[PDB]
Design an enzyme around this catalytic site. Structure first.
Site, PDB file in Angstrom:
ATOM      1  N   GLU A  75      37.339  49.253  11.013  1.00 20.48           N
ATOM      2  CA  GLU A  75      37.177  49.416  12.496  1.00 20.48           C
ATOM      3  C   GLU A  75      35.408  49.860  12.777  1.00 20.48           C
ATOM      4  O   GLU A  75      35.394  50.891  11.760  1.00 20.48           O
ATOM      5  CB  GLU A  75      38.018  50.182  13.209  1.00 20.48           C
ATOM      6  CG  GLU A  75      37.678  50.222  14.607  1.00 20.48           C
ATOM      7  CD  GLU A  75      38.408  51.557  15.164  1.00 20.48           C
ATOM      8  OE1 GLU A  75      39.602  51.799  14.870  1.00 20.48           O
ATOM      9  OE2 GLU A  75      37.980  52.390  16.151  1.00 20.48           O
ATOM     10  N   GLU A 123      38.244  58.052  10.244  1.00 16.81           N
ATOM     11  CA  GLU A 123      39.686  57.960  10.061  1.00 16.81           C
ATOM     12  C   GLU A 123      40.128  56.963   8.937  1.00 16.81           C
ATOM     13  O   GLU A 123      39.607  55.757   8.833  1.00 16.81           O
ATOM     14  CB  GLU A 123      40.309  57.047  11.190  1.00 16.81           C
ATOM     15  CG  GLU A 123      39.683  57.509  12.681  1.00 16.81           C
ATOM     16  CD  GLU A 123      40.330  56.976  13.934  1.00 16.81           C
ATOM     17  OE1 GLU A 123      40.025  57.107  15.096  1.00 16.81           O
ATOM     18  OE2 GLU A 123      41.290  56.242  13.997  1.00 16.81           O
ATOM     19  N   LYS A 159      47.415  52.215  17.138  1.00 19.75           N
ATOM     20  CA  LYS A 159      46.842  53.033  16.693  1.00 19.75           C
ATOM     21  C   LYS A 159      46.998  54.305  17.324  1.00 19.75           C
ATOM     22  O   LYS A 159      46.416  54.439  18.295  1.00 19.75           O
ATOM     23  CB  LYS A 159      45.337  52.975  16.400  1.00 19.75           C
ATOM     24  CG  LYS A 159      44.453  53.968  15.562  1.00 19.75           C
ATOM     25  CD  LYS A 159      42.925  53.304  15.466  1.00 19.75           C
ATOM     26  CE  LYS A 159      42.037  54.049  16.224  1.00 19.75           C
ATOM     27  NZ  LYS A 159      40.716  54.217  15.873  1.00 19.75           N
ATOM     28  N   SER A 180      34.138  61.016  21.044  1.00 17.30           N
ATOM     29  CA  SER A 180      32.752  60.236  20.782  1.00 17.30           C
ATOM     30  C   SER A 180      32.903  58.922  21.376  1.00 17.30           C
ATOM     31  O   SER A 180      33.471  58.060  20.918  1.00 17.30           O
ATOM     32  CB  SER A 180      32.845  60.243  19.121  1.00 17.30           C
ATOM     33  OG  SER A 180      33.836  59.535  18.598  1.00 17.30           O
ATOM     34  N   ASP A 214      35.491  48.066  18.344  1.00 14.72           N
ATOM     35  CA  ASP A 214      35.632  49.395  19.039  1.00 14.72           C
ATOM     36  C   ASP A 214      34.586  49.775  19.887  1.00 14.72           C
ATOM     37  O   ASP A 214      34.427  49.204  21.300  1.00 14.72           O
ATOM     38  CB  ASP A 214      36.150  50.643  18.360  1.00 14.72           C
ATOM     39  CG  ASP A 214      36.484  51.846  19.543  1.00 14.72           C
ATOM     40  OD1 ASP A 214      36.489  51.768  20.455  1.00 14.72           O
ATOM     41  OD2 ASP A 214      36.649  53.050  18.643  1.00 14.72           O
ATOM     42  N   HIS A 269      35.861  64.153  13.967  1.00 12.13           N
ATOM     43  CA  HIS A 269      37.282  64.498  14.424  1.00 12.13           C
ATOM     44  C   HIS A 269      37.690  65.492  13.399  1.00 12.13           C
ATOM     45  O   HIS A 269      38.670  66.285  13.825  1.00 12.13           O
ATOM     46  CB  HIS A 269      38.441  63.321  14.272  1.00 12.13           C
ATOM     47  CG  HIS A 269      38.326  62.368  15.425  1.00 12.13           C
ATOM     48  ND1 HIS A 269      38.964  61.237  15.506  1.00 12.13           N
ATOM     49  CD2 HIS A 269      37.453  62.058  16.478  1.00 12.13           C
ATOM     50  CE1 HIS A 269      38.725  60.532  16.398  1.00 12.13           C
ATOM     51  NE2 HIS A 269      37.689  61.110  16.895  1.00 12.13           N
ATOM     52  N   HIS A 327      45.035  54.912  21.171  1.00 10.59           N
ATOM     53  CA  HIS A 327      44.993  56.139  21.763  1.00 10.59           C
ATOM     54  C   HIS A 327      43.415  56.465  21.767  1.00 10.59           C
ATOM     55  O   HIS A 327      42.511  55.942  21.395  1.00 10.59           O
ATOM     56  CB  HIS A 327      45.499  57.390  20.886  1.00 10.59           C
ATOM     57  CG  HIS A 327      44.948  57.404  19.545  1.00 10.59           C
ATOM     58  ND1 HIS A 327      45.456  58.403  18.972  1.00 10.59           N
ATOM     59  CD2 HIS A 327      44.289  56.635  18.810  1.00 10.59           C
ATOM     60  CE1 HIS A 327      45.096  58.447  17.663  1.00 10.59           C
ATOM     61  NE2 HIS A 327      44.071  57.481  17.519  1.00 10.59           N
ATOM     62  N   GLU A 347      43.187  64.175  15.577  1.00 13.43           N
ATOM     63  CA  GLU A 347      44.247  63.324  15.692  1.00 13.43           C
ATOM     64  C   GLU A 347      45.452  63.441  14.627  1.00 13.43           C
ATOM     65  O   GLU A 347      46.427  62.570  14.457  1.00 13.43           O
ATOM     66  CB  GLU A 347      43.596  61.738  15.323  1.00 13.43           C
ATOM     67  CG  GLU A 347      42.681  61.649  16.373  1.00 13.43           C
ATOM     68  CD  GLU A 347      42.582  60.199  16.473  1.00 13.43           C
ATOM     69  OE1 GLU A 347      42.533  59.536  15.525  1.00 13.43           O
ATOM     70  OE2 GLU A 347      41.661  59.564  17.552  1.00 13.43           O
ATOM     71  N   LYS A 356      41.252  50.199  24.285  1.00  8.85           N
ATOM     72  CA  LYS A 356      41.416  51.570  24.838  1.00  8.85           C
ATOM     73  C   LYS A 356      41.137  51.372  26.395  1.00  8.85           C
ATOM     74  O   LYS A 356      39.996  51.041  26.801  1.00  8.85           O
ATOM     75  CB  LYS A 356      40.112  52.275  24.428  1.00  8.85           C
ATOM     76  CG  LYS A 356      40.347  52.697  22.769  1.00  8.85           C
ATOM     77  CD  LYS A 356      39.151  53.420  22.372  1.00  8.85           C
ATOM     78  CE  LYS A 356      39.203  54.291  21.126  1.00  8.85           C
ATOM     79  NZ  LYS A 356      38.052  54.658  20.138  1.00  8.85           N
ATOM     80  N   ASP A 404      38.708  53.500  10.176  1.00 11.88           N
ATOM     81  CA  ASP A 404      37.975  53.265  11.266  1.00 11.88           C
ATOM     82  C   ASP A 404      36.594  54.558  10.834  1.00 11.88           C
ATOM     83  O   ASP A 404      36.809  55.330  10.690  1.00 11.88           O
ATOM     84  CB  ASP A 404      38.540  54.135  12.505  1.00 11.88           C
ATOM     85  CG  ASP A 404      37.603  54.220  13.667  1.00 11.88           C
ATOM     86  OD1 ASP A 404      36.444  53.737  13.519  1.00 11.88           O
ATOM     87  OD2 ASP A 404      37.665  55.270  14.524  1.00 11.88           O
TER      88      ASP A 404
END
Lengths: 435, 439
Positions: free
Chosen positions: B296, B169, B399, B40, B323, B160, B376, B212, B348, B247
């Site tokens: 996040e 997350e 992370k 995403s 992010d 995810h 990641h 993840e 990132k 997150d």
């Protein structure tokens, strides 16, 4: 040759410690990581301290490398190119028949890292070193058919389905690149069909990357896979392999296909002959090309009878039956119980013994499927092993977690490096060592 | 030293989709980097170039980006014979070849692989580890190296993981120990306890994992997930030593100016969609109820007013991480700093596309007193660059997944190697993670 040998623990693909070995020569530093291990296999050493990693620490095995193996092997000044002498030395440090004093995981890391050091000493890729020391037939290299987990059952899923793993094997194409692409497309179509038919949660993956919906029967699983192959667009090009793991439901000499049901009706448990009839029906209905552990690990007569029924047209693979163990392998060959071997290097503990087991299989006309373990790492050694041994078959997971894809990516790099000097095993995977 | 040969191929990422890998050869040997991919992506990320051929990889091939490396970038860069230690000159050259603000001519996934491989070659040319070269080119403060708190995504939701859980997350952050090794051991033990507790409360399938590596139970509320994690921490034996981070990835359920906490339900009722103020009040309750240390993307990638309001309320109590808001982009970080919208950057590298621009993003953040968490993507590989990057930048925070799939453990294993290499020359960021660059 070895000037420094150092071990450490790192984490495997399930979050459990395993052994990694740094093996230094004048050609540089060479690293191997041992996958997860375990009466018939070499024994991995775990610490058993319940207050750390739930008893799964490997500090003792790590110390066996740093404190016993490293200074002994370094003092021996053994040429790393002589893999058999390196491994003969390693075995002399532990007098037990299953490597239980030092640890199979302590010994194996050194064995494999030395093979990597030796390839670089000769200026050749690791798979070419392995081809040399295993005496593979000269010619084009053979790249393996990836036997790719897609669907899990048995111990690994709710629902009644007793068979443990279903795999796709893309044999009806001419290149390993195309095989892996088709495999990835069929896997993604299966995930999509799984989520729609069984719900969004059913698309979450297990340890080896496959899905595990609540499936009732083998036919339902096989139909799902057949649907994914068709929807992806590759009908007729994708074989199916099963790992039944029938030891899990062997009871009173019969086979309980409802073994997860505490009320399982014992009058419906299948005799050896009745389970063979079932496999023969599935073989008549689906493009099943290989079956692993169709009968229990010590139900020898059932294996032999089944092999006479189907052995000339399908691959029959020992896993629990053979345990990468020379004595068991010799038994199965002489009994004619199967025609293919799962090769798990950490079940035996050295590269030389692994190559021996593979060569004893080839000599009997058996196939070899080089195999991952459930607890894998970012190490790619078995990719070079499957190519070097000319096995034509590798079992290293679904195309969906990097401890699985790292092996397949490495075969991509091997394929590109070789070009026209490589051949994809395709439908010839059973006898690939003879191509 | 300078590039003698540059070659790209596609490989498969941890979700089974192709991505770009670059082979960068110099006199010191061959250096390999692999480009990650988000499942995403924020709308402001640099362009990831995909082929869109629906007959191959369901349109997700990267043959064009690979050919962009092999046929455009490689001959040009090789001709220029740029010293690889001069990372900024390498990246300036790459950026000149594309000439667009979002790297949409060549693709950020053609550029980044070359950028990262160059830095690995640069470390070898200097005889130093990658994290040391990164410390040098980022002008990190001199002193002990800082090892990062591993923020481990042990319960997956959102895009995810299949299931009802809206937030993407839920992470543990083992801040209350003295070494990175202990932090990882505790993290793995909490995770294993979480998996056991999850299967016994939600069924065996709930123990299967998301992209993840976190468990993916079909649960509906953040409270359910947080209670599960608190129980896992307690039953593992580490009550009070482990913080929680979230997150939210709230852009994924921002619709019609509201926030749909049931967004994976196609029949989600728009009456239950939360306003910005209603969502901020839920965060405030959760922050009081649980040892949450970081959140996040609490609000959507351009919902500036809501970020500013939320920061005014709790910016002094927790880390608030951009992010999708900032996409590792100095121009958007500037806006966030001036508006006082957040106090930390999720870094990132593939959101911006070169190492030099990523380091500028980190240094701009630090200059404002922000934290930086190196991260990641959900589509990861066996590549371990971000482990050294997190150490070299002195971020104190990384992370890189749950302690489960090996595209996650590969990075954490690499930090174990760095820790062992550094010995007394490293400090574990621990409770100081937010301002670790100043330690």
């Amino acid at each position: 040759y070895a000037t420094k040998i150092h071990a450490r623990y790192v984490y495997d693909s399930r979050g459990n410690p395993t052994v990694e070995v740094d093996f230094t020569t004048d050609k540089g530093l060479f690293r191997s990581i041992v996958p997860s291990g375990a009466v018939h296999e070499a024994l991995e050493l775990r610490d058993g301290d319940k207050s750390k990693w739930l008893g799964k620490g490997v500090l003792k095995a790590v110390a066996n490398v740093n404190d016993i193996i490293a200074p002994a092997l370094i003092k021996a000044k053994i040429d790393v190119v002589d893999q058999a002498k390196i491994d003969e030395f390693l075995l002399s440090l532990d007098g037990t028949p299953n490597k239980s004093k030092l640890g199979a995981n302590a010994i194996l890391g050194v064995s494999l890292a030395a093979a990597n050091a030796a390839a670089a000493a000769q200026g050749i890729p690791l798979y070419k070193h392995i081809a040399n020391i295993s005496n593979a037939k000269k010619g084009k290299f053979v790249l393996p058919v990836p036997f790719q987990n897609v669907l899990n059952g048995g111990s690994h899923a709710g629902g009644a389905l007793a068979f443990q793993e279903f795999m796709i094997a893309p044999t009806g194409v001419s290149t390993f690149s195309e095989a892996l692409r088709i495999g990835s497309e069929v896997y993604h179509n299966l995930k999509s069909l799984t989520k729609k038919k069984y719900g969004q949660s059913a698309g979450n993956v297990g340890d080896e990357g496959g899905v595990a919906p609540d499936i009732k029967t083998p036919k339902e699983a096989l139909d799902l896979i057949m649907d994914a192959i068709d929807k992806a667009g590759y009908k007729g090009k994708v074989g199916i392999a099963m790992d039944v793991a029938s030891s899990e439901f062997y009871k009173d000499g019969k086979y309980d296909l409802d073994f997860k049901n505490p009320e399982s009706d014992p009058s419906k448990w299948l005799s050896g002959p009745q389970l063979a009839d079932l496999y023969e029906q599935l073989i008549s209905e689906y493009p099943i090309v290989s079956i692993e552990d169709p009968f229990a690990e010590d139900d020898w007569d059932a294996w032999v009878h089944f092999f006479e029924r189907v052995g000339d047209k399908i691959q029959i693979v020992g896993d629990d039956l053979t345990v990468t163990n020379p004595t068991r392998i010799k038994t199965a060959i002489e009994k004619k119980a199967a025609n293919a071997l799962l090769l798990k290097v950490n079940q035996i503990g050295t590269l030389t013994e692994s190559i021996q087991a593979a060569n004893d299989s080839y000599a009997a006309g058996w196939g070899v499927m080089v195999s991952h373990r459930s607890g894998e790492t970012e190490d790619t050694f078995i990719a070079d092993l499957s190519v070097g041994l000319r096995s034509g078959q590798i079992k290293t997971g679904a195309p969906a977690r990097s401890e699985r894809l790292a092996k397949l990516n490495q075969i991509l790099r091997i394929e590109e490096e070789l070009g026209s000097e490589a051949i994809y095993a395709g439908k010839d995977f059973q006898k690939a060592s003879q191509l």
